[PDB]
Amino acid sequence: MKIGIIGAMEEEVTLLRDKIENRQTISLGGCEIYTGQLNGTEVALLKSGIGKVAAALGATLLLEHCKPDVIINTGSAGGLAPTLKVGDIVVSDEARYHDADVTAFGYEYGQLPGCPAGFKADDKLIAAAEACIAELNLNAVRGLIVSGDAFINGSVGLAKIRHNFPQAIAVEMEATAIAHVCHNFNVPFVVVRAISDVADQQSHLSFDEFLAVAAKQSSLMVESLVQKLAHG
Amino acid sequence: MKIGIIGAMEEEVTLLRDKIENRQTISLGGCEIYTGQLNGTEVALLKSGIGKVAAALGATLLLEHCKPDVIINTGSAGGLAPTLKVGDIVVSDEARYHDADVTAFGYEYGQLPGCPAGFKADDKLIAAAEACIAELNLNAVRGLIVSGDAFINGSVGLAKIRHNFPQAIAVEMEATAIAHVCHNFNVPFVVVRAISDVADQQSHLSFDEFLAVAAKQSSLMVESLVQKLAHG
Ligand SMILES: CCCCSC[C@H]1CN(Cc2c[nH]c3c(N)ncnc23)C[C@@H]1O
Ligand SMILES: CCCCSC[C@H]1CN(Cc2c[nH]c3c(N)ncnc23)C[C@@H]1O
Predict the structure, then answer these.
(1) Is A4 annotated as a binding residue?
(2) Which residues of A6-40 are buried (b: 16+ CB within 10 A; e: fewer)?
(3) How many Cβ atoms sit within 10 Å of the Cβ of residue A68?
(4) Ligand 1 contact via A178 beta carbon (within 6 Å)
(5) Which helix (H) or strand (E) holds A27?
(6) Where is B91: in which H helix or E strand?
(7) Is A172 annotated as a binding residue?
(8) Which of residues 202-231 of B touch A (CB under 8 A)?
(9) In terms of DSSP bridges, do strands B31-38 and A119-120 run parallel, antiparallel, or are they unpaired?
């Protein structure tokens, strides 16, 4: 098994990258892919850069150049569900765009024509993630993650998301793009992120303070998940 | 010279596709790329599907698999500039995301971190496009094109764009994604689209009525532009 891992920011990939043995770097299309072994398992770790198009470009290169068997999206997220605190884990069962709108032609809010309204994460990957959460005694919520190209910071931006996706557990800027690419290539995916902020008026301050905390929790989860998948 | 051409919808690529001699089809990642000769010039024409991620995925495959020398983005657009009528041509000097917002961290509205605030189209390609416009006696405007994942249909969606980008001449859903991918691969690009609607409350009705008109005008421009570039 080769496990593909995608993170947007330096801070979200640095802990995993440092653990990769025999590390090689592919530099293509403005992104970096690091290949080698993570606790004995072959991995390909993409640092994509921020937002939907960066993520889409990077994921496409990762799939084409490395042919990973599955994709895990790691990093931070803005928490939306009431029981989430900084550091807590969010696991996708599904990803949707919160900023896509072709409802004038009768598509569901968030749905682009030619796509399902949402992209479902892989059941086996979800189950493995939940097993790791249990083993590591972490607080986690499984559910809908929504993506757009905006850093959510209270005001009207948060309000629109709570209005249109009251079931969304977290918001970020890459997951659904990754999900979409994986859908089109028929590659299983899961998102395993951790909370850096609660997407309110203070979220920029919380993000600066707690990105590192969130990166560490997600990275430790991903390390555990890689091991669990490779062993099983 | 090999010219890369990208269109999102069937209607936007069908006229060019039908003119391709010795046509072959590559089907990968949910998109189609058609290769062959257009009036003697080698071309690779991508049908990407709609929106930013579809466009990004498709453009990445096009660049990787076909290595075109330049990229031309064809199709329809929502007109924003006052002198534009249905069928008229818009030529990018630049592309920006109208839905990207990381201003909480001091980036320019529409700018994603790690990107320029806008992506500049190639001066030589712009000049060739303007020469074709003159030769074909078309009404055109050159300027900023903005992209997002929403079909603009008056109300608050149009209002936000007029507020944040009063200089934008047109709006659509793929151009900036294509521009971003081309930027990251250092490939020159130009957008040459035609107006299907003016992005107001009636734009869905106008789009249904005039997509074919807009596709034809853009396609005829692109055919002329391919010839002009290959000859010069
Ligand atoms: C210049 C500093 C970076 C600003 S953009 C935020 C990063 C972290 N990612 C997740 C993320 C955490 N909190 C969020 C929020 N409140 N809104 C939207 N995304 C998030 C998305 C993107 O890769
Ligand atoms: C289900 C029918 C298709 C609906 S989505 C519209 C198509 C046509 N493209 C350009 C386009 C023309 N007018 C526009 C407008 N008012 N807003 C935003 N984009 C546009 C973008 C996208 O590929």
Answers:
(1) no
(2) bbbbebbbebbbebbeeeeebebbbbbbbbbebee
(3) 23
(4) no
(5) strand A20-28
(6) strand B89-97
(7) no
(8) 203-204
(9) unpaired
Q: What is the CATH number of domain A1-232?
A: 3.40.50.1580
| B89's tokens | 């041509």
Contact B226, B212 (CB under 8 A): no
Question: B151–A104: do the CB atoms touch at under 8 Å?
Answer: yes
Tokens of A64: 């084409």
User: Which are the contacts of B136, defined by CB distance < 8 A and separation ≥ 6?
Assistant: B220, B221, B224
Q: What is the resolution of this structure in A?
A: 1.6
Strand segments (E) across A98-224: 119-120, 140-147, 168-172, 189-197
* Contact call for residues A198 and A59 (beta carbons, < 8 A): no
The CA distance from B20 to the nearest CA of chain A, in Å, is: 25
The answer to whether B81 touches B143, Cβ cutoff 8 Å, is yes
The structural domains of chain B, with segments of one domain joined by +, span 1-232
Q: Nearest bound ligand to CA B193? A: 2
Q: Which amino acid is at B89?
A: I
